[PDB]
């Protein structure tokens, strides 16, 4: 697992300038100048941003700067804007004509107003109950930042059986979404007092509740 | 224009084999070495190796040596990345990129393939089952739940494409079983109940399974 | 009983210039001047001997070397010329007595998207000697570090290909070349003109 040491997360506010480090060994970033920097937006192929330490391909804006010192290359973004939010990888050639990459750096840009999650809880339906199964669906939408905890309560008891939650997904309004599903036989569904969903965000929590018919 | 075009996505069962293709166009195929780079979902880029199109000479990263093979065919200007006896560790996107020149000069990758997703799981093709989540009764949301399907993805439209706004289609969960499930809600004004008619259309093309289910208050 | 010029000149496959082919024709009659008046050949040039009067002159054997190069390199198949084809692929002696025939093959040796079947040697540590033929695939060490048969920095695959596509300029288009070397040994007779 030999990779160029690169910070996992950096961020900064719009209009400012950030720099991402990337630290190699004698055998690559130190001896040669074949360092390059790729940008990856979620779901697409990496895009070459800098090559030969400092050179930009055609079309890459002048806001992207390259530099190298000792064993440490670094990429600088000036005048940070919204769409610079992405993964950034350093890479370099080695003295044994091999290619190596960096761990990657997720860059977010600050300044969004912070939104509280909007959760809706749905109980199992008739057609599903008639198939001998039941699922509670907790849908959390339109929140920022994209990090929430979720907890299910039968009666007011903890549940460790049959809950599965999504990792936060970024929606097309640059806000986040998540889902969780609790699976039960109908017999357990109508056994307990009520089923409910506590989503913790901000540190605060928000609760939704549903009861059998 | 230089174009690197890769094969379409592949879903395979553990123990099987896969051969990603990458066809180059718009430049002298023998002039540049090719890099193969894999990326597991949510993870970083991993150099798999390089191949010289004219000599076929290869060099593999130590992580992928032995169980991966790179080949090429210059008759069709294509490079091939083959991994056989898949494990579920190998679920990843595989990229080809054009690298340095024949004399090792332009040592970077400017042109990448679009990427080939290879999904290896022991599940097998199963169409979903969709259920209506009845509206609530400040406004009210109705939903469609697409339970237990494989593989991804499914397309969920609301009201025959005629309902564009207020829809939140959420990304799927992957349960321990090996099947996905998903939910799509529309928020409609409070006491809008039986105003319109509200059908969600679900399609899951690998199964060959599309179904239109209507959501309505019950009892 | 005259020598198969028809399928040395009209042969379907031609060789790459690094692995140029040679056909030794002997014991036949030959008529050369239905060929000297080209119409088909963009180059027909002769050295020591001259195209005239040669259906009346004789030798002991005929060697026909055939290959394919790009237009801008046909000027290199002549005595005393330099360049990577003359230095690393096919070299004629200063004392050459013979001829050089070349014609455009773009309509059959090119291909849309590139014909990569024709190769040429681009790296070698020293120039070729006259009529020497090198088909080594050894990795070329262009630096101080040895290569050990694996390509890398300053270690190159010595061959490269032309990639003939029909949309190129005539200087980069495929030209088929046949060189005829005439045998003067103090010994018997062989191929003669009418
Ligand atoms: C090559 O073929 C053409 C057409 O068949 C013929 O006219 C020509 O004489 C041939 N060339 C030789 C050297 O025989
Ligand atoms: Zn990420």
Ligand 1 pocket mutation pick from C5, C8, C10 by most atoms within 8 angstroms of CB: C10
Q: Which two tokens mark B103?
A: 């004399």
Q: Do the Cβ atoms of C154 and B59 come within 8 Å?
A: no
Residue C31 lies in a domain: yes
C152 reaches A (C-beta below 8 A): yes
Distances (CA, A) of C31 to B46, C148, C178, C191: 66, 52, 16, 10
Counting ligands in written order, which one lies closest to the CA of residue B41? Answer: 2
Sign of CA dihedral B57, B61, B65, B69: negative
**Cα–chain center distance at A184:** 30
Residue C166 backbone class (left: φ over 0; alpha: ψ -120 to 50; beta: rest): alpha
Measure the CA–CA gap between A113 and A78, rounded to whole angstroms.
23
| Same domain membership, residue A102 and residue A67 | yes
Give the C-alpha separation, A213 to B137, whole Å: 12
- What does the DSSP 8-state code read for residue B36? E
* CB of C5 sitting under 6 A from ligand 1: yes
- Which helix H or strand E contains C7, and what residues bound it? helix C6-9
Q: Which residue has the tokens 């990429």?
A: A75
Helix then strand then coil, % of chain C, to nearest 5: 15, 30, 55
Judgement on whether residues A136 and A199 belong to the same structural domain of the protein: yes
Whether residue A151 is found in the same domain as residue A205:
yes
Establish if C103 belongs to a structural domain. yes
Q: How far apart are CA B96 and CA B6, in angstroms?
A: 8
Phi-psi region of C48 (alpha: psi -120 to 50; beta: other; left: phi over 0): left
What are the chain C neighbours of B59 within 8 Å (beta carbons)? 150-152
Residue B113: closest CA among B52, B24, B32? B24
Helix (H) or strand (E) holding C109: helix C106-109
Q: Structural domains in chain B?
A: 3-120 (2.60.40.10), 129-214 (2.60.40.10)
Collect all residues from C whose CB is shorter than 8 A from any CB in B.
Answer: 113-114, 116, 119, 137, 142, 150-154, 156-157, 159-161, 163
DSSP assigned state of B211: E
Residue in chain B closest to A181 (alpha carbons) equals: B173
- Distance (angstroms) between ligand 2 centre and the Cα of C98 equals 70
What is the dihedral sign for C-alpha C122, C126, C127, C128?
negative
The C-alpha atoms of residue A22 and residue A38 are separated, in whole angstroms, by 12
Write out the two tokens for A132: 């001998």
Q: Count contacts between A and B (CB, < 8 Å).
A: 114
Residues facing A77 on adjacent strands: A18, A64
Mutate to test the pocket of ligand 1, among C9, C41, C105 (most ligand atoms within 8 A of CB): C9
Looking up tokens 């105003």, which residue turns up? B195
Q: Are A137 and B145 in contact (CB under 8 A)?
A: yes
* C-beta atoms of C116 and B104 within 8 A: no
Contact partners for chain A, using 3 or more CB pairs closer than 8 A, are B, C
How many angstroms does the Cα of residue C102 sit away from the middle of ligand 1?
A: 15
- For the record, the structure tokens of C161 come out as 């290909």
Instruction: Could you list the beta-strand ranges (E) of chain C.
Output: 21-25, 28-29, 43-47, 62-70, 98-104, 119-121, 140-141, 155-156, 159-161, 174-182, 191-192
**CA distances for B211 relative to A111, A127, B131, B202, C59, angstroms:** 43, 15, 11, 5, 87
Give yes or no for residue C9 CB within 6 A of ligand 1: yes
Q: Return the beta strands (E) in C56-193 as ranges.
A: 62-70, 98-104, 119-121, 140-141, 155-156, 159-161, 174-182, 191-192
Residues 96-155 of A with CB under 8 A from C: 96-97
Count Cβ atoms below 10 Å from residue A126 Cβ, excluding itself: 12
Identify whether C1 is part of a domain: no
> What's the CA dihedral at A130, B125, B90, A87 to 10 degrees?
-70
Task: Report chain A's C-alpha Rg in angstroms.
Answer: 24
- Quick check: A51 and B110 CB within 8 A? yes
Structure token pair of residue B150: 């494989």
Q: Is C51 exposed, middle or buried (0-12, 13-18, 19+ CB in 10 A)?
A: middle
Tokens 């199109």 correspond to what residue? B53
Give the separation between CA B22 and CA B115, rounded to whole angstroms.
9
With a CB cutoff of 8 Å and minimum separation 6, the contacts of B43 are none
Same structural domain, A127 and A163: yes
Instruction: Give the Cα separation of A114 and B191 in Å (integer).
Output: 30
Candidates A160, A119, A159; CA nearest to A137 is: A119
A198 by Cβ neighbours in 10 Å (0-12 / 13-18 / 19+) ranks as middle
Q: Do A143 and A90 share a structural domain? A: no
**Domain final residue pick, A57, A76, A109:** A109
Our CA angle for C91, C93, C95, nearest 5°, is: 165
In angstroms, the CA B7 to CA A197 distance is 43
- Is the CB of C172 inside a 6 Å radius of any atom of ligand 1? no
The answer to whether residue B101 neighbours chain C at the CB level (below 8 Å) is no
Closest C-alpha among B69, B86, B97 to residue B5: B97
Domain boundary among A66, A90, A109: A109
Using a 10 angstrom Cβ sphere, with 0-12 exposed, 13-18 middle and 19 or more buried, the burial of residue A23 is middle
* Residue C64 Cα to ligand 1 middle (Å): 16
Ligand 1 centroid–CA C6 distance in Å is 6
Phi then psi for residue A172, to 5 deg, are -80, 15
Chain position carrying tokens 């929590």 = A205
Q: What angle do CA C171, C175, C177 make, to 5 degrees?
A: 135
d(CA B205, CA B112): 28
| Residue A86 sits in the same domain as residue A123 | no
- CA A112 – CA B182 distance, rounded (Å): 28
Residues of B in contact with A127 (CB under 8 A): 131-132
Nearest CA-CA distance, residue B18 and chain C, Å: 27
B168 to each of A172, B176, B187, B197, how far by Cα in Å? 10, 25, 8, 18
Nearest partner of C183 among C50, C49, C19, judged by Cα: C49
3-state secondary structure string, chain A? CCCEECCCEEEECCCCCEEEEEECCHHHHHCCCCEEEEEECCCCCCEEEEECCCECCCCCCCCEEEEEECCEEEEEECCCCHHHCEEEEEEEECCCCCEEEECCEEEEECCCCCECCEEEEECCCHHHHCCCCEEEEEEEEEEECCCCEEEEEECCEECCCCEEECCCEECCCCCEEEEEEEEECHHHHCCCCCEEEEEECCCCEEEEEECCC
Cβ atoms of C158 and C124 closer than 8 Å: yes
Residues in a beta bridge with B189: B139
User: What's the residue count for chain C?
Assistant: 194
CA distance C194 to C185: 21
Q: Tell me whether residues B104 and C114 touch, CB distance under 8 A.
A: no
Distance CA C36, CA A79 (A): 72
Our count of domains for chain C comes to 1
Identify whether C177 is part of a domain.
Answer: yes
Residue C144's contacts (CB-CB under 8 Å, 6 or more residues apart) are none
Q: Which two tokens stand for residue C92?
A: 């004629």
Number of compact structural domains in chain A: 2
Q: What angle do CA B121, B124, B127 make, to 5 degrees?
A: 125
Among candidates C131, C177, C150, C192, which has minimal Cα distance to C2?
C192
State whether residue B88 is helix, strand or coil: helix
Q: In what order do the strands lie in the sheet with A72-77?
A: A18-23, A72-77, A64-69
Nearest ligand to the C-alpha atom of residue A146: 2
Q: Cα separation of A51 and B209, whole Å?
A: 47
Could you tell me if A22 and A29 are in contact, meaning their C-beta atoms sit under 8 angstroms apart? Answer: yes
Task: Scan residues 27-66 of B and list those with Cβ closer than 8 Å to A.
Answer: 35, 37, 44-47, 50, 59, 61, 63
Closest ligand to the CA of C8: 1
Who contacts B178 (Cβ-Cβ below 8 Å, separation ≥6)? B121, B122, B123, B150
Return the beta strands (E) in chain B as ranges: 3-6, 10-12, 17-25, 32-39, 46-51, 58-60, 68-73, 78-84, 92-101, 116-120, 129-133, 139-149, 155-158, 167-169, 173-174, 180-189, 199-204, 209-214
Residues A36 and A71 reside in one and the same domain:
yes
Q: Which domain holds residue C188?
A: 6-192
Per the domain annotation, does A2 fall within a domain?
A: no
Phi, psi of A84 (to 5 degrees): -70, -10
In terms of C-beta density within 10 A (0-12 exposed, 13-18 middle, 19 or more buried), how is residue C58 classed? middle
User: CA–CA separation, B134 vs A123, rounded Å?
Assistant: 9
State which approach was used to obtain the coordinates. X-ray
State if residue C37 touches ligand 1 by the CB under 6 angstroms criterion.
Answer: no
Q: Which domain holds residue A75?
A: 9-109
Q: Which residues of B108-123 are buried (b: 16+ CB within 10 A; e: fewer)?
A: bbbbbbbbbbbbbbeb
Interface test with B, best of A122, A164, A166 (most B CBs within 10 A): A122
Q: Please tell me the distance between residue C98's alpha carbon and the centre of ligand 1 in angstroms.
A: 21
Residues A70 and A46 in one domain: yes
A126 in the same domain as A202: yes
CB-CB contact of A20 with A88 (8 Å): yes
Alpha-carbon dihedral sign for residues C151, C153, C158, C159: positive
> Hey, is C99 helix, strand or coil?
strand
Give the Å distance between the CA of C31 and the centre of ligand 1.
Answer: 13
Nearest to A29 by CA among A10, A52, A55, A7: A52
Q: Give the span between the Cα atoms of B196 and B159, in whole angstroms.
A: 9
Question: What CATH number does the domain containing C29 carry?
Answer: 3.30.70.1840
CB-based contacts of C151, cutoff 8 Å, min separation 6: A97, B52, B55, B57, B59, C139, C157
Same domain, A73 and A146: no
Same domain as A133, residue A77? no
CA–centroid distance, A104 to ligand 2, in Å, is: 9
Q: Which of A109, A127, A154 is the last residue of a domain?
A: A109
Taken in order C116, C118, C122, C123, is the CA torsion positive or negative? Answer: positive
Tokens read off for C194: 């009418």
Asked whether B179 and B191 are in contact (CB, 8 A), the reply is: no
d(CA A213, CA C165): 74
The CATH code of the domain that includes A22 is 2.60.40.10
Q: Domain for residue C135, yes or no?
A: yes
Contact call for A48 and B133, based on CB within 8 A: no
Residue B84 tokens read as: 């056989």
CA C107 – CA C98 distance, rounded (Å): 28
Task: Tell me, yes or no, whether A185 and A105 share the same domain.
Answer: no
Residue of the CA atom closest to atom 10 of ligand 1: C6
**Do the beta carbons of residue B143 and residue B127 sit within 8 Å?**
no
From the CA of C12, which ligand is nearest? 1
Q: Strands A105-109 and A9-12: what pairing?
A: parallel
Place of tokens 């699922």: A135
Buried b (16+ CB within 10 A) or exposed e, B193-216: eeeeebbbbbbbeeeebebebebe
| CA dist., res. C83 & res. C88, Å (int) | 8
Scanning every residue of chain C, which has its alpha carbon at the shortest distance from the alpha carbon of B76? C113
């Amino acid at each position: 697992s030999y990779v160029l040491t690169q910070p996992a997360s950096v961020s900064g506010s719009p209009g400012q300038s950030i720099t991402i480090s990337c630290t190699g060994t004698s055998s690559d970033v130190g001896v040669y100048n074949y360092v390059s920097w790729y940008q990856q937006h979620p779901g697409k192929a990496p895009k070459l941003m800098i090559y030969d330490v400092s050179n930009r391909p055609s079309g890459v804006s002048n806001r992207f700067s390259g530099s190298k010192s000792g064993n440490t290359a670094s990429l600088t973004i000036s005048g940070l804007q919204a769409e610079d939010e992405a993964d950034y990888y350093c890479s370099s050639y080695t003295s044994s004509s091999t290619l190596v990459f960096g761990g990657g750096t997720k860059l977010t840009v600050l300044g969004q107003p912070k939104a509280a999650p909007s959760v809706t809880l749905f109980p199992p339906s008739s057609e599903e109950l008639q198939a001998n199964k039941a699922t509670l669906v907790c849908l959390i939408s339109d929140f920022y930042p994209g990090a929430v905890t979720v907890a299910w309560k039968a009666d007011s008891s903890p549940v460790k059986a049959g809950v599965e939650t999504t990792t936060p997904s970024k929606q097309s309004n640059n806000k986040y979404a998540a889902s969780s599903y609790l699976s039960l036989t109908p017999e357990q569904w109508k056994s307990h007092r009520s089923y409910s969903c506590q989503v913790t965000h901000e540190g605060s929590t928000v609760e939704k509740t549903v009861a059998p018919t | 224009e230089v174009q690197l075009v890769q094969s379409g996505a592949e879903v395979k069962k553990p123990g099987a084999s896969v051969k990603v293709s990458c066809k180059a166009s718009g430049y002298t195929f023998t002039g540049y070495y090719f890099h193969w780079v894999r990326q597991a979902p949510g993870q970083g880029l991993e150099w798999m190796g390089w191949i010289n199109p004219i000599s076929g000479g290869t060099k593999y990263a130590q992580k992928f040596q032995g169980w991966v093979t790179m080949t090429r065919a210059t008759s069709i200007s294509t490079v091939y990345m083959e991994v056989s006896r898949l494990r579920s560790d190998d679920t990843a996107v595989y990229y080809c990129a054009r690298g340095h020149t024949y004399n090792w000069n332009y040592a970077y990758c400017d042109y990448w393939g679009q990427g080939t997703l290879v999904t290896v799981s022991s599940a097998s093709t199963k169409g979903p089952s969709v259920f209506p989540l009845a509206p609530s009764s400040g406004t009210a949301a109705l939903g469609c739940l697409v339970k237990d399907y494989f593989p991804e993805p499914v397309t969920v439209s609301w009201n025959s494409g005629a309902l564009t706004s207020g829809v939140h289609t959420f990304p799927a969960v992957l349960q321990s079983s090996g099947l996905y499930s998903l939910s799509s809600v529309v928020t409609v004004p409070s006491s809008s109940l039986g105003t319109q008619t509200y059908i969600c259309n679900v399609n899951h093309k690998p199964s060959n399974t599309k179904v239109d289910k209507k959501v309505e208050p019950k009892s | 009983n005259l020598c198969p010029f028809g399928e040395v000149f009209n042969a379907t496959r031609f060789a790459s210039v690094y692995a140029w082919n040679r056909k030794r024709i002997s014991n036949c009659v030959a008529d050369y001047s239905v060929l000297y008046n080209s119409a088909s050949f963009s180059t027909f040039k002769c050295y020591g001997v001259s195209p005239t009067k040669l259906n009346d002159l004789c030798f002991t054997n005929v060697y026909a070397d055939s290959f394919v190069i790009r237009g801008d390199e046909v000027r290199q198949i002549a005595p005393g010329q330099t360049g990577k084809i003359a230095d690393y692929n096919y070299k004629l002696p200063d004392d050459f007595t013979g001829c050089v025939i070349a014609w455009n093959s773009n309509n059959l040796d090119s291909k849309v998207g590139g014909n990569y079947n024709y190769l040429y040697r681009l790296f070698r540590k020293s120039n070729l000697k006259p009529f020497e033929r090198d088909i080594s695939t050894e990795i070329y060490q262009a630096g101080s570090t040895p290569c050990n048969g694996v390509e890398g920095f300053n270690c190159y695959f010595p061959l490269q290909s032309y990639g003939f596509q029909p949309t190129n300029g005539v200087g980069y288009q495929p030209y088929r070349v046949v060189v005829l070397s005439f045998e003067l040994l103090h010994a018997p007779a062989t191929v003669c003109g009418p």
